[PDB]
From a paper:
We present the first atomic-resolution crystal structure of a multimeric ring form of a viral dsDNA packaging motor, the ATPase of the asccφ28 phage, and characterize its atomic-level dynamics via long timescale molecular dynamics simulations. In contrast, a close homolog of the φ29 ATPase from the related bacteriophage asccφ28 (gp11) has been shown to form highly soluble functional rings; extensive analytical ultracentrifugation and small-angle X-ray scattering experiments show that the ATPase forms pentameric rings in solution. Individual subunits within the ring are organized into two globular domains connected by a linker domain, each of which is nearly identical to the corresponding domains of the φ29 gp16. Like φ29 gp16, the N-terminal domain adopts the canonical ASCE ATPase fold, while the C-terminal domain is a ‘vestigial nuclease domain’.
Two crystal forms of gp11 were obtained: (i) tetragonal crystals belonging to space group P43212 and (ii) trigonal crystals belonging to space group P3221. While the three structures described here were determined in the absence of nucleotide, the active sites of ASCE ATPases are well characterized and can be accurately identified. Two distinct conformations of the Walker A motif are apparent in our crystal structures. One conformation binds either a SO42− or PO43− ion in the canonical β-phosphate position. The ion forms hydrogen bonds with the backbone of the Walker A motif in lieu of a β-phosphate, typically provided by ATP or ADP, which explains why the Walker A backbone adopts a conformation similar to a typical nucleotide-bound ATPase configuration. However, because the structure was solved in absence of nucleotide or nucleotide analog, it lacks any interactions mediated by the α- and γ-phosphates, ribose sugar, or adenosine base. Thus, this structure likely represents a conformation with mixed characteristics from both the apo and nucleotide-bound configurations. However, the crystal structure of asccφ28 gp11 ring reported here shows no such helicity in the N- or C-terminal domains. We suspect that we do not observe helicity in the crystal structures due to lack of substrate DNA imparting helicity.
Residue numbers in the entry:
A (entry chain B): 8 to 367
B (entry chain C): 7 to 368
C (entry chain D), D (entry chain E): 8 to 368
E (entry chain A): 5 to 368
Write the structure that this text describes.
Amino acid sequence: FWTPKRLLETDDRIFLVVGGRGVGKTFNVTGEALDDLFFNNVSMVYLRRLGVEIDELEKNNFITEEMLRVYFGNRFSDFNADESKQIMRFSIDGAIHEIKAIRNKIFFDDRCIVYFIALSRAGHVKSNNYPDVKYLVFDEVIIDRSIMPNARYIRNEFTVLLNLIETIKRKREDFYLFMLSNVGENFNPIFAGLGYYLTHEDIKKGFVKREDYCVQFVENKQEELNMTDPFVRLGAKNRDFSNSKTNAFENIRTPYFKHYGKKPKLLVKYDRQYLGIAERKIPSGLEYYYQVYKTLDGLENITVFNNNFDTLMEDEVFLEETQLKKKFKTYFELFQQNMVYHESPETFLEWSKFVYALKL
Amino acid sequence: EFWTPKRLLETDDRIFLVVGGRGVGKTFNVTGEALDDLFFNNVSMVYLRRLGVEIDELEKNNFITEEMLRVYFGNRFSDFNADESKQIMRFSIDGAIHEIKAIRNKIFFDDRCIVYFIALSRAGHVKSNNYPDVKYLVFDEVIIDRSIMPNARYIRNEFTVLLNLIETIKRKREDFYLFMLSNVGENFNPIFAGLGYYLTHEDIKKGFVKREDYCVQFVENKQEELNMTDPFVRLGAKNRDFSNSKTNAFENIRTPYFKHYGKKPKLLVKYDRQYLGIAERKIPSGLEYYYQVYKTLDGLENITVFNNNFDTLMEDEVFLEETQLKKKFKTYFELFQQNMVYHESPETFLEWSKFVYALKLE
Amino acid sequence: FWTPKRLLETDDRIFLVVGGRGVGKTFNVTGEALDDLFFNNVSMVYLRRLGVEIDELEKNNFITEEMLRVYFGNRFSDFNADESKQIMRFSIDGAIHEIKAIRNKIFFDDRCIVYFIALSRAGHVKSNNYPDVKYLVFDEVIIDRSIMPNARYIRNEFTVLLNLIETIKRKREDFYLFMLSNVGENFNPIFAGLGYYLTHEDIKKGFVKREDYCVQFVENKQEELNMTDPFVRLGAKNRDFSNSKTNAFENIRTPYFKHYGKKPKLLVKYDRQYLGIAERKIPSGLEYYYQVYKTLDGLENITVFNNNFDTLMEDEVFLEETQLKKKFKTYFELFQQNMVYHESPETFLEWSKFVYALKLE
Amino acid sequence: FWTPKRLLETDDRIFLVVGGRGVGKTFNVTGEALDDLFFNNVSMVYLRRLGVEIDELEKNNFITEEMLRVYFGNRFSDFNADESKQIMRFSIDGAIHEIKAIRNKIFFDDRCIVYFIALSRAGHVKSNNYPDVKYLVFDEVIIDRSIMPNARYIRNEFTVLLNLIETIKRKREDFYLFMLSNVGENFNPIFAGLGYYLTHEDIKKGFVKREDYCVQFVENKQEELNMTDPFVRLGAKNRDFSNSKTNAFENIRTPYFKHYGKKPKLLVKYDRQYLGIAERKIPSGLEYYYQVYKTLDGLENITVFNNNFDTLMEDEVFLEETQLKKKFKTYFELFQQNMVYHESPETFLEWSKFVYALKLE
Amino acid sequence: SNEFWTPKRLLETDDRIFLVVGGRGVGKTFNVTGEALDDLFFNNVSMVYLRRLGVEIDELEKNNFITEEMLRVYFGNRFSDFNADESKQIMRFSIDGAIHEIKAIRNKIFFDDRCIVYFIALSRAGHVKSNNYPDVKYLVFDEVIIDRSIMPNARYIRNEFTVLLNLIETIKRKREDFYLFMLSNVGENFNPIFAGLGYYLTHEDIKKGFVKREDYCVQFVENKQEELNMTDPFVRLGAKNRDFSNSKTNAFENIRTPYFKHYGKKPKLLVKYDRQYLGIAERKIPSGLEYYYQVYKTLDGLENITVFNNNFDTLMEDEVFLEETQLKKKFKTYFELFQQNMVYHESPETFLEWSKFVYALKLE
């Protein structure tokens, strides 16, 4: 079982809930919000990375009779629904309420309470048609490689995400973000943008608080498997399917960490800092170290490459997008694969922001 | 005509595999028997297809037919009137007024959805979708026919995607039925590997096979006389390729080669409480391959072990990643897919098939 | 000028109409059927080889106001309404009828009477249901190279067609199939599946009767050309346009025929017979002869390839996609081009069925 | 400034209009026809080379309110229109008329008066769907390379056009064809089928008459450019755009002409004549001459290639698409670029008909 | 409120052509479309929304082109009784007590059964040279300059400006009252639109914020410096991500300034273009070779240098005809050298002349 009520008590307005596959995190987040959506004149936005995730989604059953029964209990009554017209009719507290699903929106008493959006299509939703939105739920935020073999994150995904947060949330203090992931691993833009490094010790804690967001890990429910049912036995016989259920933390993609004293081969100035790559000669080949330097101390003659022309100065060489791909592509490949040593987790996150921001 | 799912439903098993009997209207009869439940027992149905086009090209309009309503409800069916332009059917059963409307990928009976159309290719994205009262799931054309379709490929880790859909479509429902309908029956398909069924001519002769979790039935085309007064029938008989198709359900069952090799395998992969090994035996013409299964790592101290799962990875085993499996296991998978390797026994062949299809790439 | 009224009187239920481009073969076949579709509760299916043929087709103009008037004459009236809804409101015998065309269907009084289908997509519609189809029209059955530069027949097209006949036609004695071709030539799967060899002698006769089907040839009507009209004079000056009207039978793709005594290099067992290819060394290079042998007499040690695993036996070599491409790809190309000798037209038809059944693109 | 009243008065029924960019030739031609379409029970067909030219065309605004006012003046009144449903309602002479534009048709009082067709889609259309067509307008008949960078003529375009003329016009003496081109140049299929060789001397006259058609040249008006308007000033500053206005006759693609006595290397029999290519060895390389021979005199042993199997005879070698691409593909390219010598303009037009009829691309 | 950019100041000026660059996320399209509404709704004038590529329009949501907030902002109190049908994508509302409905179908938006907005793609503009647009008063070319960040390899149309000018003629016929709005999120040189206008982008102009020319006016939109609340976590998260923060001020990150130098020696080749002669000079240097792009008003001291003429009509004397096949063989490398900042231009004026020539004849 899982509920958002505990997190909503905390001051933080941003939550990352990872794990607990099949525990209905999306059901519970939507259910707890209902009272606000129905009667506090606030909306919700359901976000997905790709349009296909929403086009194939069954909007009509996003809100269910059972969901209304669980969250409103006895107050819920007189349920009658016309699935053919995507209309739900019921009574709460004796009042008559009707829920209608149209195109990519859900309406409660002729007022939109849920908006369905795809990050791929975020650019066209630049119109501010989101006045009353109080909740944003980004389901399946982290790609599952097991379930999907070749799913790719959006180019500069976090920048696209942050733009959508701003468009939907405008000078609105009362706003909430609920990123939900079935799988938790490192080396994803969402983790880099947040600044969160996933470690087994944090998973053991189960709850993690940070300056701008809160991270929670959900333990998969130990529900018994009925062996009288053949379908349960069939699933148990297939190991790949059975392992999937508990594969949330199968691999967290921990990176290699090592320290190299020697000065770096090259530097790139990004975000008030200089990122450096150091090559160490070893008999087999080369050992790569990725480092961050706060100031250009002891690096007088090392060339500095600047992605941004506006902040370009002194003897730095302007690196254009085509020129940058020519040289840092191999270094980027080394970063994507766990083939380089990182000075510390803090440095690893700075490098991740740069790679994913500029990745092509 | 003669085949009906009434006999299978009498059996306790809730999972059925129906092979053969092409053109016998297996889908038609399965849908008709369910109608009584869908119309009056408040249970929905899901029609499943491997690819979206299989559904996009499907005529949802005629999925339920007037003849179908008449045959299964007989005299109780009356006053049939339909507006095909608006995809609306209006009829009477037992004196009540019922209207069937088909819109997009759903069919509605009296304002209640009774049939859902879904494609396994798009199943992954609908892992959160809700289907309240589904009692029947029908996977038509479960086994690809190479003759009818030249180059159709199974989905990556297809059986896992199917099992996830079973869980999504079926949630805490003891009363559920799954129907797998295949016009062609052959080995070397993921559906057969996931079930654990090895197709053999001996089983086909019996015509009925029962297993712990599922039941398999084979439909033999009736050797019915062909009316020669009709010209269309005569034209088909003259064409051998078309005529063979009628009885080509079991033309080739893709039986694999079996032999035993004593020597130790070249490499090992740890899968499902066991170790799978590949053995290479040098022969003058070229090389010989043997696929074996070892219950324990006894006498295999220094043989390299590949582990698919990082969580259970330990000691000196090599982690199996998409890049690593392609480098080493790409050729071996091709050798397995083609009937180019020796298998210790049919039991081992099924173990290898699950592993190959789970990690196979395309 | 041409209509299928005469053919429908005949007992045969399968007809092949070749030639007569611009004679409204589609119109007359569709017009004569109307009485059945409108009042006899029978549907029609319009078939095309490729989806592209139907996607570009204008379904709403499949039935025209002119069409209704010609076939129903005085009985038809009150056609002055078009509502942009694909609806045509008119009168026959005083009754009010409305024809609505939506997507790939045409509806008459809320009942679908015409279905548009592409043979490429027939495989996916094996489970599709067509309740009351009585007519199937395969228009432009034979590819026109001039009009269409590079159109390719479907793999095992005739088997796909026969399967579609079965799906569209189930337990129906009263069924009609119309194959309409603007051009008639050999070396096409449709002709091979039927068993018809196109010869100039048959075209002059104009009528050919067979066990399972009837073939009729439509000659473009001869007309004096009014030269007072400038448009006619302009056309006469362009030779290509003038040639096009009589180009229906310009080339019938006749193959070379010769008999070679020597034993064949290889044999393939197909359809209760053995097909053999014989290679004869000549100073310039090699000569090819395609032969059929009733029995394996005097061919004891020649290798035999069997396409069907079920009938495979003894020392025959299993024929799979890899094996046939390795050995039969060049032979199939030699067959497609008029580069081999055939024992007789009968043997040529046997080889054509085999090539097209197993050919890959 | 320009109207087709003068051309319609002339006996010729086929007209080619070149030049006069921005003079609203299509607008004015459509307006003059209206009286016939509205009250004389005759339809019109608007033709374009490619489908998008029509798909992107605004059918609703093909006939405009301003156009009705201009052509009917005071008689036009009580205008009310629903653009959302593409319906126009107005009164002419006190009567109530409504124009409905739906799909590829425009309806005037529930009678279609304009049909939109694309030559690419011409194959799909039959003569049944067009009862009373009196006007055919082929706009932008000659491709403009400045506005459209890479538009290609249809294969055997003139034959496709002539077939469409026959389909749209059947046994109709009262028919008119308008070919409208912003730019006029040689080496295009339409000019070749007509038989017209474009020369500057013809342009100066402004009017050219032939047996079957009439050619008129419209020069863009040399009216002063208002510099108070900023948009006009901006266009003048851009020379490429400014040149385009008067670029109708910028380059007429005149061919090179020379005579070579020696006999040709090869001959092809086309349209009751023999076309020959002569190669002359020169120190730099090779020189090409394209010739036409009325009779096979002095060419006894030169090989002759015949495209048409029906006319194939004696020792001529059959020409097929694969074979001709091997030999005539380079020659067609040498012809397309001004790299060959033509005996005379008459021969150039004969060679042009052959090249474009069999050209592939 | 005052923060957002609006074209009220621009409309007061006599100029009818405006170029607006920068101000991403300031609703330039929103405000321009909103101010026009009064004309579109009640002055019987239509609007045309232009985009370079068809995908830009096919993916565009026409239904949200006009929004309730736009109507409420621009009509203020007069706007009331807003009720829209989501199924039909029909908006219904009240202005001044009158009944108005905005319906969007296909590539058109209809106001009270009258089309007020047309969506057109410059790629498809060529074939619509005969199209009729009766009462268009506003033409808006949004995203006129391609953004490399948002779109990785989007190509300008061949001879784009000539295609654009032709579309202006088709949309605007004998209409003195016409307005053209060019909206760009990013501003840079080496683009065809800036070349056709004749505008050279320089940092000094951006600081001024306003630039006036004979036929057009250029304005630069600066993102309003609104303070960022750091108590809100969402704001802090955005500040931590430099890429998101940089994107707001990346309008003028790189203006692609060209290199300029003068070479005395006579040019290797000449092309006669637009009543002038363009010459390319190659200078041998130890490292390799150096390129200079020059313009000569007259053929003085260039007697024997070959001249290439694109236009047959003005071809004369010993000039060599320039044809599509000939130009590709030699000017392909030169066009590439120009596209990259690898050549020296005599001055910004010459660079603009060279840009007109390159893009007119450029191929892709």
